[PDB]
Structures are given as C-alpha cells and as structure tokens.
C-alpha cells in the first residue's frame, strides 16, 4: 500500500494515478518502494485502456525526498552502485511509458524525487513546493538520470548552475527556468498540482489513443537521432494511424459534424 | 495556378523574395496542386543567385495555412494517404533547406501542415491575434509534416508533447511565451503586421555578405544535428569558404576607409 | 606578461581562480600572443587539483573582449587566416573542457571571439549595459571560434540564426531575455558588478564535494554529446567515482550530525 | 493456439526454457497470432527469475520458420504492410534483448523473417541439410525483420550484402563456412540434431552464476553499441553487480572447500 | 585518352556496367586523368537509373591497379573518389586478376564484394615508404578483416596472393587464373548476373539500409531499415513479386 | 622486483622491447605488485622514443598469465574488489594504447586477466598447446579486464558470448580457428615457440618508418571507434603527419637510389 495504483472512472476513465504513500519515510525511494514502482510501471507499460498516467504523492507537503538516506547509511560501498542503478533503471522505465505522463508536484521533490518527475512528459507544481538536485552537497552527483535529463529540459547552463550550487527552487522559480510547465497556488487540501494534472489529463483523453502513443514515440525517438532520420521515424509513426478505424471515425465524425468517439484501433 | 505568387521585391527590398499563398477558398490548405507549385517555387529559389532572404506569407487576411485539404483528403484511398503526406513532409523539408534566411509571416490561422511549414523557416513572426497549433491527434492522426520533429527541437520536448497531446491552439501572444515564434505584433487594419515586421527584419539581413550568410546558415543547421566536435569541424569548413572571397576583402577595405560595405556575393 | 593575469584568490575565495584579460590598448582583442598565454593558463588550470571554480573576466573597464585583433587580421594573408582562426577555436574549446565550473563575468563589450569565449564557459553573467554579439556577417565572414555551434545550443536555432544573420549587438537586459546569459545586474560605479556576481555565485559552489563537482560536469558535458541511453551509462560511471571517496561518507556523517560538511576532495 | 509451445524443462535441464513453433500448416510462418503469442511468451520470460537459458526451435520436421505468411501478405492492403512488418521487427528485437543466453536450433528451413529471428539469438546451430537465407530482394522488398542490420553485424558487410543482393539460400554447411552459425550438425533420424546440440550447449551454461551470466550479456550487447571507452565503463558497472552477491562468495567458498559451486542466482 | 573504358553490357548481362582501367603504360596507377575520368564516370553511374550492378576490373592482364603542400590535397582527392565509389547506389564488385597495391587495394575495398585469382597480388605497403594508407585503407581494411589482421598487414606492409587474401577474408571468392587472365572478371560477371533478377528499387534501398545502418547504433539502424523497407511497399515490383510467386514463374521487374 | 623483466633487445633485434612476466610461484597471476610494475613499465614505454615494437611474454614455461590471484582476492574486502579490478582494467587499457605495435606471445595458460591482457595487444600468437579462455562466469563474476568488450570486438558477438557463457578454455589450434589469435605453431623443446614467432614478426616491423607505424596504429585504433566519415577524417590527419618528415623523403630517395630505406623516426 506504499504505492497506490488508481484506475479512475467516470469522466476520468482512461486516467491512471500512481500515488506514493510513504509518509513515514518521506516517500523516499526504498528497496521496496522501487520494487513496487517497477511492478506498477511494467504492468502499465502493456495496459490496454490506459490513456494517461499521473504520478503524485498522497502525503501533504511531500512528493518524493529521494534516496532513503537511512538505508544508504547501512549500505556497504559495494552495494551502493547496484542500488542506485536500479533506481536509475526504474526511472528510465517511467520515461519510456507508452502514454502521456504527468508528475504532480505538491510537495518536496529532491534528488531521485525530482529525477523521477523529470522522467515524466510534463511537470506541474505548487508555487510553495520545493525541488532541486542537491547531490553535490552530499559529495555525490544526481544518479537517477538527472545529469542527463535536467540539461535536456532546461539547457546546460541552467542545469549546471542548479547541480553545481545544489540549489533548491520553489515552484515559481522552477517555472521561471522552465523546469515545470505550470505553477499553481496551493489550495487548502494541498493537491493543487494534482488538480491541474487531472485537468490536463482530461484534456488528453478525447484524442485518438493510437495517435497519442505513436506521437510520443515519434517525439521521443525523433529527438535521439538526426533530423533526417527523425522525419523517417515520423513517417513510420504516421503510417501506424492510417489503417486504424479511429482515423476513419475521425473523418466520419467530421462529416456528421459530431464529436469523435475513438476506441483505440 | 496563381494560388502561389512569387514576388521579387525591388528598391529598398532588393534581394527579398516573397512566396505568397493565395487559396482563400481552400483556406490556403495544402492541396496537391499547391504543394507542386510550392515545390516548383522552392526548387527555383535553390538556384536563384540573387535572392538574399525569403519570406513566406499569406495573401488572404485572417489565414496563413489551415494545413491539410481534408475534403481532398476524404477522397483519398488508404494507399494514397501515406505517399501524399510524405510528399508534404519532403517539400516542407526542402523549404527548411533553403540556402538563405527564411521568415514565416503569420498574420492568420496556421494549423497542422500550416504551422509545420512555418517551423521549416528559420524565423517566425506572428500577429498577437494569429492562431496556430497541431490538432492532428483530435483526428486520430499525428503531425505528418515534420511537426513531431521540428516542434520539440524548437520549444523543447515537454511543451511540444503538451501541445501535440492536447491538440491545443495558441494565439500569437501565447506562442511568443512558449518560444514558438520570435516576434509578436498587434495586428494592423490592413491585416499584415507580421508581414510588415518580416520585411523589416529581412531588410536587416540584406547588407551582410551573401556567401557568409549562406555558409553561416549551413553551419548552424548541420551542426545542430551532430555532436560539438563534428559541428566545430563543420564551422571551420564553412568559414574556409568565406576566406578566398572578394566580399571578405571588401569588408576589410570598407572598415579601413570607414564606409558601408557593398558586397556582391563573391 | 600583463596581457592575462591569473589570480588564485585567497581565504574567503580559496579555490576560486580568476583569469583576467588585460590589453586595453587593443580592446582585449584575441591577438596571436594573447591566446598563447590563455592556452598556457588553461592547460595548467586543467591539471590543477586545488581549483574549484574558474572565473573569466576583464581588468579593463567597459571592455570584455572585442574579438580577434582586427589590426593584425588585415595584415594576414588568405593562407594564414584559416590556421589562425582555428587555433582560437581550439583554445576556446579547451576552455569549454575545463574540469571545473567556469563563469564568464561580462562588464563590457563582448564581440565575436569575445562572446564565443564566454559561450565556452558554463555560466555567463553580465551588467545590463554590457554589449555583446556576433557581427562577423557584416564583415562577409562567419563566427569562427565556435559561435555557430555554441550560440544555437545555448539560445536555440531560431534566435541564434536571427542574431547571426542580422549581426545584432545586445545589451545585458536583452541577452538575459533570450537566455544568452543567466544573470543580469545593473552596473556599479566600479564597473565590475558582473565580476562581483560571479564571485558570489562561485562561493556558492565552493562548499560542494570537489570530486562530485568534477564528475558532474563531466557527466553533463559528455552526456549531452551522445544519445540519452549512452548518457545514462556515462552518469553511472561518473557516480561510481564518488562511491569510494571519503567525502561521500563525510557527506552522510555531516547530514546526520546537522552540520556543514568539510570536504577534502577525496 | 497451441501454435507456440513454452516448455520449462526439468531434471538436469531445469532452468532451460524451450519456445517451440508449431504451425505446420503455415510452415511456421509469422502470422498475426504467432507474433502475438511469441510476443507474450518473450515478455513473460523477460521477467522470469528462474530462466537461465532459452532455446528457440521448431517442433515441425524439416521446417524452422518460412518467414512471412504470404497468404496474409496478399490479403492486407498496402497501408497495413508497414505497421505489421514493423510489429515483427519489434518482437524479433525483443527476443534479441532477452536477458539470458538464447540459442536458435535450426533443423529446417529458415527464410526471411525466419532467419532474422535466428539472428536475434546469441548463438545459432543448424543441421547441415537445413536451408536458410534472406530472399526478400527476389520479391522486390528487403529483409524487414532486422536482417539488413543483424546479418552484416554477424558475418560482415561484404558477405551480408552478397547474401541479400543475390537472395541466396545456403545449407547448414555453407552457413557455417561464412560464420552465420556456430555449429553445424549432421541431421538425425528424428530430425532434431540441431536441437540436441542446442540442449547440450544450454546445459553447459546452467552451472554458471545466473546474475553473472545476465550482466555479462548486458555488458557485451550494450558495450558493442558504444565506443570502447564507454564499453569499459559499462563493464565496470556490470562487474560491480556481481560483487555484493551471495553467489560470488559461494564461488570462493567452493574453491577453498574444493568442490562444485552451487549458485542461487543472488 | 580512353584510359577508362565504360562497357554497358547487354542481352544476357543487360544492367551490368563494367569500368575497365586500361593504362598498362602506367600499371593502372592513379594518375591525374585516371582519377578525373574515374570520378566523372562514377558521377554518371551514381545517377544512372538503368544500372543494376557495377563491376570494376582491369583490362591489362596481370595488373589490377598499383599505388598512385601538394601531396595532401591530391591524396584526399583519391580518397574522396574512392569513397564516392563506396557510395554507388547499386551492388559493386571488384574483379582482381592482377596486382592491387595501395590506392589499388583501397579501391577494391570501396566495392561491396571482391573476387580475385589465387595468383593475383595485393597489399598496403605505404609503411615501407614511411607513410600510411591514404585512400581509406586504414579505415576500410580493419572493418573488412578485423583490427588485428589489418594492423599486421599494414605494420608489415606484407603482400598477399588471392589464396591468402581469401583465408583472411580480404576477398569473398578466389579462383585459379585461366589462360586469358580474366578468371576473376569471369566470376564477377557470373555473380553480377545473380543479382540482375532482383527488384531494382529493393536492391538499392537494401544497400542503403546496410551501409547507413552499419554507421550507427542498432536501434537507429532498425529505424533506417524501416524507412528503406517503406520505399518498396508502394512499388509495382512488390506486387509483381507476389504475383510471380503465385503463378510460380520468374518475376519481371521494372524498377518501379 | 624482477617480477617483470623489461628487455631492450640489441643488434638484429634493436628497436624491440620485451616485457617478460616471471612469477612462477603465482602462475604469473595479476598480483597488486605485478600490475604496479606493469603499469610502471608501460607508462615508461609510452615515453620511449627508440621503441618500435613491444612483445609481451612469460619467462615461465607452460604459463602466460593465470589471471587474478585468488589468494590475494580471497583476502580482499568487498569494497576493495571493485577499485582493484578497475585498476587492472585501466592498466590493460594503457597496454592497448601503447603507440607502437604490440604482440602477445602465448606459450602457455592465458586465463581471465591473462587473456584480456593479451587481447589488449594488436597481434596475438600462440603455441598449439597453449590454453586460454575467460572462465569468470564459473566463479559467478564476469571478465573484468576489458574482456566483455575486447573479445566481441575481436571474434564477434556470437562467439564471444558462447565462450564467456560456457566459460570454456580453448587451445591454440581452436583459438586460431575462431580468430582469437593470428598465428598458431607447434611448441618446441624450450617452450618458447610463440615467443620465437613474435620475434620474427617484430623484426618484420623494424624496417618501416617509425612515424608512419605510430600514426597507422593511431588511425586504426581511433578510427574503429567512430563512424567511417569521422574515421576517414582521422586518416587524413594521420597521413598529413608523415608528409613533412625526413623519413618520407628518405623513402622516395631510397627508392630513387634504388637502395633500402634507412629511417630514423623523424
């Protein structure tokens, strides 16, 4: 129960929420939480109905504090490398989820915590939330992919400044450097970011499921190769939409001037 | 065929060429006829040795390019769609490879293939009231004119994903905020503030050495698709091409005699 | 020679090494001799194990670096141009590969090779009145010290092209708006406000684990030159360098005791 | 249906899993259903802790896999060919990425997609009378299951190009001669010579430490995708994974007590 | 001077184009004109859409092609033309019936396939001249026979005959020389004729997929294969292929 | 310590340096003291200007290098293992980066680190009776001295995987058969047949231009870790370095006076 997987219903049908529930250990990335997060992600990776995934915390004021420093203290040096690589690998699995992913940051997101959010496609946070990669202050470096993703998200100059200074930014500041896409004033219940994430996710729902997946594929893979190859990849992804019923439905709904009803095929 | 006009401006705008889309009835949609014409016009400019800057814009107020000609698309068999969309992607790419600076003047709606055509230009300027976006996913398809590649490279993966995922339309002001365009302007009563702004920016390019401008664009486009070590080698090669030119000497001579340089592109 | 001073700050700023260009008589231009000493200071700083942060600044008020020494360039023959320009490009790349955080304090004019030099630093700070840009095209050539590669990578292709195509010069305020610099502050009566902000920022880096800081810059720089999967493997190798260090343990100890860590760089 | 059999062996074969194609009516062609089943079996096996080696074979005499189901390829329209061929390319790539040692036992015909599947395994063994080749160019298409990529990497470009250009079918003896397979066997009365050799080979793998076998494969596969300097770092990270394992200690313990090691895969 | 003959075979070998070097008065050495013509001829074929296979041979018995601030520029010209040969759109075969040294062997290494008489000689002896292979040999040799053997050959500047070149994988086919001295060429034609029946569009993108895919990581190579495959999907030849297989007859491709 | 003898042959072998391992009591195992000496000797040789070829062999009959010292490893703390293994990997890598041609003469057992050290040499020669292989996986670890990277690069992914997975040992005959060594020969009464062939091969390198040999190895090693376009660029630079040498002219001059070249490495 430290990791809750909720498959929403009603107007939110198609939306899945991964909630970290370890208020006792500040939602830190323990061997067990990593184990379940990995199982959840692996299961979702091949889930039919899923149209959008939101990753958030069910603990007020905290998203994910990162590495379980208690455990790290007990860990012998020979065990540190392998464990941190396990974390790096699960976060990369999140980055490769087939559908749109949104991280709802309503609390502290440090180290692995921010790196996890960096693995999502879009980040939204409260203006009061705190985030940063403070690893160099501990004489280590971001090991969950941060040295790689932060720079690709906000440019090397800003990424280096944040990693070199181990600075902690608030929502407003994170928004200013583009670390996040939407900043929200926190509400009484403390789920303002989550609320924004749910709305954004509902804004994704009506789109063609196959098109959304191949679009994410084209963008993610396209950005890893040169432009010419990226264009060929786009062609291949576009080809996946051509023989779908949905594409036809899109046209039919247009002829009948009615809203499309996509099935994901 | 007058759906695409190519005007070689003169006098104060000598050097600037303008490609104007004129398909009001089709909302400047990318019909097969239009792509061929644009493809034909693009291939001619790739050889023109007088052009110093190209501006792409609309002749029809309120519209830039609504993208795909769906009515013509609805008549296309499944086996025709792929080849045709690729044709569009390839022509937009040829535009992206134009040898000289290109500017997209967005004074109206730029959707799908329209915005994609805009992304192929080096610089985009738009009216604050202009509307643009990639709505493909609402039709169970995806941007097919290079949009899944050029949007992320232009505004970053996170914003590109949100825009494509949501199939959201943005106005000039919102586009300036996410960095989709470089200049936003309040629309004028003629409905061509963006075009006027494009002309002003273009004239700002006219004075520089033609060869340098060409190799500079080549260095930037090619270098951004390889690693830095490779890109630096590309820069050295591009720089080498300006060394034995008459214009470089003219630049030092002009600087010596304290006077405006008058380059010839040689 | 007093053309380039290398001060290894003391006490409060122990670990900070300042590099100051001093050639007011030549606008700090990148002369044949100047890059020679620069290359010398860089090759040294590179192997220096005591440095934690390097700041590049000018000791000449109102001037950072005007670029290549134009007076000597006019005297250069066509065959000596390429080699020389390449030397500058290489030394600037050597600055881009310095082992520790580098900061460019711009309290004056930064043109051509001068701005390129600053682009080679991790972070750039400037006074609102500081001037900078790549004007090479107005001289029928192109930026040749890595500018056609580093500018687009820092501010994006569209903005980079516009600046190079128009050979536009910007002030600190504008540079900050396009993301060319990370920090902008109003100048002071001493004309060293940038140098001051740089020092303050540098001190912010000092408390961090020395080994971690080095492999972190290594991870970022090398990771951005390859695809993400390879990038992740590079992060893994860098991280592995901090695991067996005494500083790592001191980090966990200091966190536990609620006190400032005292890293020794091992 | 029962077209794909997944057999978890027992006794002196426990740890060995066998995936057997069983579609005699379609010459074990890669139909929509076989790919779906193949894909689910592979995905399941990827997270199976108990597996130490996987063998891919045919339970149909004289036939390994004829490749594409031409009865279906003729049925589907053009727009459906691309996505389907890519599906096959993807499932074959999933097989190449299985975490444990994989062996392809070729006791029959392996054409196009069939051979490509075999190329996805770590090791290939075949009967001297078995026939294999990528004859796609004779059908006016090219190997679509990864063959243009895996064949050249396995036997070199010159030989791969000759096989693909000529669309030649080789027997096990000739396949061995060009390095396409590692072991060639004289076929037996039951027609399972290749398989028998594959089983013996798999048994040679079983006694080794499971975690070590997995990271060894990871080090080799990924190390070959990057430059050597990066590959060595990946080796270190993979080696580091064996250090804190109980099996490594057992290895040492067994050496002192001078006896056969008994690994648990942890 | 007709130093380079471009024979456009027909009938039985229609689609095959032979490039014969004829300069026995220079042992087919790479001279200014040879390189200029050779280059001009490659540019011609490079864009020819009727050619299905190109064979590079020597019409001077016993010899294939010997070796070759001014030096550098001219060495890069040869390297550049050899690389252009490496980029020809259709299958290329090097028929080695004579001596192949320096740029000569590097020329053959730029072809897709190499055949040679067991008596023919070849090697990269630049080191004995205090210089190194400058026509790509240092890159293409290692990639063809492996690093260790490549280095041994270049470090020792050893010369090998067809029988040896075959055992180290330098060539794909070796054969006894005939009385006419064109056994290699004879094999090359036989091989080239083996390619002729295949779909022209598929053959070309297949070479593309292979050449380009080997220059990147496998995942990228897979995307390149997908794109190349896509080019064959809408072709009439693809349907002719299926048609021919159904009627159990030989395909008649048109390259479209 | 005489654990490692460095001989600078003279007369008919002048220009050849032999690094002979002599640690019979430990089976030439890679002890911490042995690598330091090895590292010391290798670092020294990379500075030597007279060396033209380096041969690595054993001064003990029947043994090349048994790899890791299990007695010194059994007393190794889990936290010491990683750094130590990495130290071996690094020293074997420095051997691979030796500027002059290297040859491994295997006249006996070459296991683990021993075979990996041999893999770092450009050329390997072995006696028919010499045994070699990477048996790490039988100890629940993996080749940690570059084996997972160099073996696949030397004999292909499929053969390397089988050998590492099965952890089997091959004799010289079989090693020759799979391409692991370049020359195999019958052992002689003294048990130094491999060493003899290595000498005969080394003397075959002596007569070539020192500078060319050095740049040939650089072009090939560095060229094989990048794409062909880059590799060809590297070749153009390595070639350029022999153009202005006194040796290049001596080659032409020697060829002029029809006499044997007498290079001096300049």
GROMACS .gro file of N, CA and C in nm, chain B residues 100-102 122-124 153 182-183 201 204-205 208-209 212-213 215-217 219-221 223-229 231-232 234-236 238-239 242-245 247-248 251-252 255 261 263, chain C residues 70-71 73-74 76-79 81-82 85-86 89 93 116 135-150 152-153 156-162 164-168 225-226:
model
  282
  365UNK      N    1   1.917   3.043  -4.811
  365UNK     CA    2   1.916   3.175  -4.749
  365UNK      C    3   1.817   3.186  -4.633
  366UNK      N    4   1.829   3.293  -4.552
  366UNK     CA    5   1.739   3.313  -4.439
  366UNK      C    6   1.595   3.312  -4.486
  367UNK      N    7   1.509   3.245  -4.410
  367UNK     CA    8   1.368   3.237  -4.442
  367UNK      C    9   1.289   3.288  -4.322
  387UNK      N   10   1.351   2.971  -4.081
  387UNK     CA   11   1.445   2.999  -3.974
  387UNK      C   12   1.385   3.086  -3.864
  388UNK      N   13   1.302   3.182  -3.905
  388UNK     CA   14   1.240   3.273  -3.810
  388UNK      C   15   1.089   3.284  -3.830
  389UNK      N   16   1.015   3.291  -3.720
  389UNK     CA   17   0.870   3.304  -3.727
  389UNK      C   18   0.826   3.432  -3.656
  418UNK      N   19   1.229   2.036  -3.120
  418UNK     CA   20   1.358   2.099  -3.137
  418UNK      C   21   1.342   2.251  -3.123
  447UNK      N   22   0.940   3.427  -3.264
  447UNK     CA   23   1.038   3.520  -3.208
  447UNK      C   24   0.985   3.662  -3.189
  448UNK      N   25   0.887   3.700  -3.270
  448UNK     CA   26   0.830   3.834  -3.261
  448UNK      C   27   0.679   3.827  -3.272
  466UNK      N   28   1.262   4.289  -4.075
  466UNK     CA   29   1.369   4.202  -4.028
  466UNK      C   30   1.454   4.158  -4.147
  469UNK      N   31   1.703   4.395  -4.265
  469UNK     CA   32   1.813   4.398  -4.169
  469UNK      C   33   1.920   4.295  -4.206
  470UNK      N   34   1.883   4.198  -4.291
  470UNK     CA   35   1.975   4.092  -4.336
  470UNK      C   36   2.046   4.129  -4.466
  473UNK      N   37   2.454   4.223  -4.515
  473UNK     CA   38   2.562   4.126  -4.492
  473UNK      C   39   2.610   4.049  -4.615
  474UNK      N   40   2.733   3.997  -4.607
  474UNK     CA   41   2.789   3.920  -4.717
  474UNK      C   42   2.705   3.798  -4.750
  477UNK      N   43   2.867   3.451  -4.676
  477UNK     CA   44   2.879   3.427  -4.533
  477UNK      C   45   2.743   3.387  -4.474
  478UNK      N   46   2.638   3.455  -4.518
  478UNK     CA   47   2.505   3.426  -4.469
  478UNK      C   48   2.471   3.281  -4.504
  480UNK      N   49   2.684   3.019  -4.576
  480UNK     CA   50   2.762   2.920  -4.502
  480UNK      C   51   2.731   2.925  -4.352
  481UNK      N   52   2.686   3.040  -4.303
  481UNK     CA   53   2.651   3.051  -4.162
  481UNK      C   54   2.525   2.969  -4.136
  482UNK      N   55   2.427   2.978  -4.226
  482UNK     CA   56   2.304   2.901  -4.209
  482UNK      C   57   2.336   2.753  -4.221
  484UNK      N   58   2.624   2.605  -4.151
  484UNK     CA   59   2.696   2.566  -4.030
  484UNK      C   60   2.601   2.543  -3.913
  485UNK      N   61   2.504   2.632  -3.896
  485UNK     CA   62   2.409   2.619  -3.786
  485UNK      C   63   2.314   2.499  -3.802
  486UNK      N   64   2.253   2.484  -3.919
  486UNK     CA   65   2.161   2.372  -3.941
  486UNK      C   66   2.228   2.235  -3.934
  488UNK      N   67   2.537   2.164  -3.798
  488UNK     CA   68   2.598   2.145  -3.668
  488UNK      C   69   2.501   2.111  -3.556
  489UNK      N   70   2.376   2.151  -3.570
  489UNK     CA   71   2.278   2.122  -3.467
  489UNK      C   72   2.229   1.979  -3.476
  490UNK      N   73   2.270   1.907  -3.581
  490UNK     CA   74   2.228   1.769  -3.597
  490UNK      C   75   2.340   1.668  -3.570
  491UNK      N   76   2.455   1.717  -3.523
  491UNK     CA   77   2.570   1.633  -3.490
  491UNK      C   78   2.628   1.678  -3.356
  492UNK      N   79   2.730   1.608  -3.308
  492UNK     CA   80   2.792   1.644  -3.181
  492UNK      C   81   2.880   1.768  -3.201
  493UNK      N   82   2.918   1.833  -3.091
  493UNK     CA   83   3.000   1.954  -3.097
  493UNK      C   84   3.133   1.938  -3.169
  494UNK      N   85   3.205   1.830  -3.144
  494UNK     CA   86   3.333   1.810  -3.212
  494UNK      C   87   3.312   1.812  -3.363
  496UNK      N   88   3.042   1.937  -3.523
  496UNK     CA   89   2.991   2.069  -3.557
  496UNK      C   90   3.102   2.173  -3.570
  497UNK      N   91   3.203   2.165  -3.484
  497UNK     CA   92   3.313   2.260  -3.494
  497UNK      C   93   3.391   2.240  -3.624
  499UNK      N   94   3.261   2.136  -3.897
  499UNK     CA   95   3.173   2.192  -3.998
  499UNK      C   96   3.192   2.344  -4.003
  500UNK      N   97   3.203   2.408  -3.886
  500UNK     CA   98   3.221   2.553  -3.880
  500UNK      C   99   3.348   2.596  -3.953
  501UNK      N  100   3.457   2.525  -3.927
  501UNK     CA  101   3.586   2.552  -3.989
  501UNK      C  102   3.579   2.543  -4.141
  503UNK      N  103   3.296   2.578  -4.322
  503UNK     CA  104   3.211   2.686  -4.369
  503UNK      C  105   3.288   2.817  -4.369
  504UNK      N  106   3.366   2.839  -4.264
  504UNK     CA  107   3.446   2.960  -4.252
  504UNK      C  108   3.548   2.967  -4.366
  507UNK      N  109   3.458   3.154  -4.691
  507UNK     CA  110   3.450   3.300  -4.700
  507UNK      C  111   3.588   3.362  -4.716
  508UNK      N  112   3.691   3.288  -4.676
  508UNK     CA  113   3.827   3.339  -4.684
  508UNK      C  114   3.871   3.387  -4.823
  509UNK      N  115   3.860   3.302  -4.926
  509UNK     CA  116   3.902   3.349  -5.059
  509UNK      C  117   3.798   3.427  -5.139
  510UNK      N  118   3.703   3.490  -5.072
  510UNK     CA  119   3.601   3.566  -5.143
  510UNK      C  120   3.635   3.713  -5.157
  512UNK      N  121   3.421   3.951  -5.129
  512UNK     CA  122   3.347   4.020  -5.024
  512UNK      C  123   3.422   4.032  -4.891
  513UNK      N  124   3.505   3.933  -4.856
  513UNK     CA  125   3.578   3.944  -4.730
  513UNK      C  126   3.678   4.059  -4.739
  516UNK      N  127   3.514   4.379  -4.704
  516UNK     CA  128   3.481   4.406  -4.565
  516UNK      C  129   3.594   4.473  -4.491
  517UNK      N  130   3.717   4.430  -4.518
  517UNK     CA  131   3.834   4.489  -4.453
  517UNK      C  132   3.862   4.626  -4.515
  520UNK      N  133   3.610   4.872  -4.384
  520UNK     CA  134   3.643   4.901  -4.246
  520UNK      C  135   3.760   4.999  -4.238
  526UNK      N  136   3.002   4.863  -4.620
  526UNK     CA  137   3.050   4.761  -4.714
  526UNK      C  138   2.945   4.741  -4.823
  528UNK      N  139   2.882   4.445  -5.064
  528UNK     CA  140   2.912   4.309  -5.108
  528UNK      C  141   2.838   4.269  -5.233
  601UNK      N  142   4.162   4.289  -3.502
  601UNK     CA  143   4.138   4.331  -3.640
  601UNK      C  144   4.260   4.395  -3.706
  602UNK      N  145   4.341   4.466  -3.627
  602UNK     CA  146   4.460   4.531  -3.681
  602UNK      C  147   4.558   4.429  -3.738
  604UNK      N  148   4.458   4.114  -3.829
  604UNK     CA  149   4.385   4.037  -3.929
  604UNK      C  150   4.400   4.094  -4.069
  605UNK      N  151   4.393   4.226  -4.080
  605UNK     CA  152   4.407   4.292  -4.209
  605UNK      C  153   4.543   4.259  -4.270
  607UNK      N  154   4.696   3.972  -4.222
  607UNK     CA  155   4.702   3.829  -4.250
  607UNK      C  156   4.662   3.793  -4.392
  608UNK      N  157   4.740   3.703  -4.452
  608UNK     CA  158   4.716   3.656  -4.588
  608UNK      C  159   4.607   3.550  -4.586
  609UNK      N  160   4.552   3.520  -4.703
  609UNK     CA  161   4.446   3.422  -4.716
  609UNK      C  162   4.482   3.284  -4.660
  610UNK      N  163   4.607   3.243  -4.678
  610UNK     CA  164   4.651   3.112  -4.631
  610UNK      C  165   4.681   3.106  -4.482
  612UNK      N  166   4.499   3.284  -4.261
  612UNK     CA  167   4.372   3.309  -4.194
  612UNK      C  168   4.318   3.182  -4.129
  613UNK      N  169   4.279   3.085  -4.213
  613UNK     CA  170   4.225   2.960  -4.164
  613UNK      C  171   4.295   2.901  -4.043
  616UNK      N  172   4.251   3.129  -3.722
  616UNK     CA  173   4.115   3.124  -3.672
  616UNK      C  174   4.087   2.991  -3.603
  617UNK      N  175   4.144   2.884  -3.657
  617UNK     CA  176   4.127   2.750  -3.600
  617UNK      C  177   4.196   2.738  -3.465
  620UNK      N  178   3.967   2.888  -3.216
  620UNK     CA  179   3.854   2.799  -3.196
  620UNK      C  180   3.892   2.686  -3.101
  624UNK      N  181   3.770   2.597  -2.723
  624UNK     CA  182   3.713   2.466  -2.693
  624UNK      C  183   3.782   2.410  -2.568
  647UNK      N  184   3.219   3.436  -2.803
  647UNK     CA  185   3.242   3.292  -2.821
  647UNK      C  186   3.318   3.238  -2.701
  666UNK      N  187   2.905   3.977  -3.492
  666UNK     CA  188   2.883   4.064  -3.606
  666UNK      C  189   2.956   4.024  -3.734
  667UNK      N  190   3.025   3.910  -3.729
  667UNK     CA  191   3.102   3.861  -3.842
  667UNK      C  192   3.041   3.874  -3.983
  668UNK      N  193   2.912   3.848  -3.997
  668UNK     CA  194   2.849   3.855  -4.129
  668UNK      C  195   2.852   3.994  -4.191
  669UNK      N  196   2.857   4.098  -4.108
  669UNK     CA  197   2.865   4.234  -4.157
  669UNK      C  198   3.002   4.255  -4.221
  670UNK      N  199   3.093   4.162  -4.192
  670UNK     CA  200   3.228   4.166  -4.247
  670UNK      C  201   3.250   4.058  -4.353
  671UNK      N  202   3.141   4.000  -4.401
  671UNK     CA  203   3.144   3.895  -4.503
  671UNK      C  204   3.207   3.763  -4.458
  672UNK      N  205   3.212   3.739  -4.327
  672UNK     CA  206   3.264   3.612  -4.276
  672UNK      C  207   3.162   3.558  -4.175
  673UNK      N  208   3.198   3.454  -4.101
  673UNK     CA  209   3.105   3.399  -4.003
  673UNK      C  210   3.179   3.379  -3.871
  674UNK      N  211   3.105   3.359  -3.761
  674UNK     CA  212   3.174   3.339  -3.632
  674UNK      C  213   3.265   3.218  -3.651
  675UNK      N  214   3.391   3.227  -3.609
  675UNK     CA  215   3.482   3.116  -3.629
  675UNK      C  216   3.546   3.058  -3.505
  676UNK      N  217   3.496   3.097  -3.388
  676UNK     CA  218   3.551   3.045  -3.265
  676UNK      C  219   3.451   2.956  -3.193
  677UNK      N  220   3.365   2.890  -3.270
  677UNK     CA  221   3.265   2.801  -3.213
  677UNK      C  222   3.127   2.861  -3.197
  678UNK      N  223   3.114   2.989  -3.231
  678UNK     CA  224   2.987   3.058  -3.218
  678UNK      C  225   2.870   3.001  -3.297
  679UNK      N  226   2.894   2.952  -3.419
  679UNK     CA  227   2.784   2.898  -3.498
  679UNK      C  228   2.733   2.767  -3.437
  680UNK      N  229   2.809   2.712  -3.343
  680UNK     CA  230   2.772   2.588  -3.277
  680UNK      C  231   2.720   2.609  -3.136
  681UNK      N  232   2.792   2.688  -3.057
  681UNK     CA  233   2.753   2.714  -2.919
  681UNK      C  234   2.636   2.811  -2.902
  683UNK      N  235   2.358   2.853  -3.101
  683UNK     CA  236   2.231   2.782  -3.121
  683UNK      C  237   2.204   2.682  -3.009
  684UNK      N  238   2.310   2.623  -2.955
  684UNK     CA  239   2.293   2.526  -2.848
  684UNK      C  240   2.252   2.593  -2.717
  687UNK      N  241   1.902   2.835  -2.878
  687UNK     CA  242   1.814   2.777  -2.978
  687UNK      C  243   1.851   2.826  -3.117
  688UNK      N  244   1.816   2.746  -3.217
  688UNK     CA  245   1.845   2.775  -3.357
  688UNK      C  246   1.786   2.905  -3.411
  689UNK      N  247   1.657   2.925  -3.389
  689UNK     CA  248   1.590   3.044  -3.440
  689UNK      C  249   1.651   3.174  -3.387
  690UNK      N  250   1.666   3.186  -3.255
  690UNK     CA  251   1.724   3.308  -3.200
  690UNK      C  252   1.870   3.324  -3.244
  691UNK      N  253   1.944   3.213  -3.246
  691UNK     CA  254   2.084   3.215  -3.286
  691UNK      C  255   2.100   3.261  -3.431
  692UNK      N  256   2.014   3.211  -3.520
  692UNK     CA  257   2.021   3.250  -3.660
  692UNK      C  258   1.990   3.398  -3.674
  693UNK      N  259   1.884   3.444  -3.609
  693UNK     CA  260   1.846   3.585  -3.618
  693UNK      C  261   1.959   3.676  -3.576
  695UNK      N  262   2.287   3.608  -3.572
  695UNK     CA  263   2.398   3.599  -3.665
  695UNK      C  264   2.365   3.661  -3.801
  696UNK      N  265   2.244   3.636  -3.851
  696UNK     CA  266   2.200   3.690  -3.979
  696UNK      C  267   2.196   3.843  -3.977
  697UNK      N  268   2.152   3.900  -3.865
  697UNK     CA  269   2.141   4.045  -3.852
  697UNK      C  270   2.264   4.110  -3.791
  698UNK      N  271   2.357   4.028  -3.743
  698UNK     CA  272   2.480   4.078  -3.681
  698UNK      C  273   2.444   4.180  -3.574
  699UNK      N  274   2.337   4.151  -3.502
  699UNK     CA  275   2.286   4.237  -3.397
  699UNK      C  276   2.367   4.231  -3.269
  756UNK      N  277   2.651   1.506  -2.553
  756UNK     CA  278   2.709   1.485  -2.686
  756UNK      C  279   2.671   1.350  -2.745
  757UNK      N  280   2.596   1.270  -2.669
  757UNK     CA  281   2.552   1.139  -2.715
  757UNK      C  282   2.403   1.125  -2.687
   0.00000   0.00000   0.00000
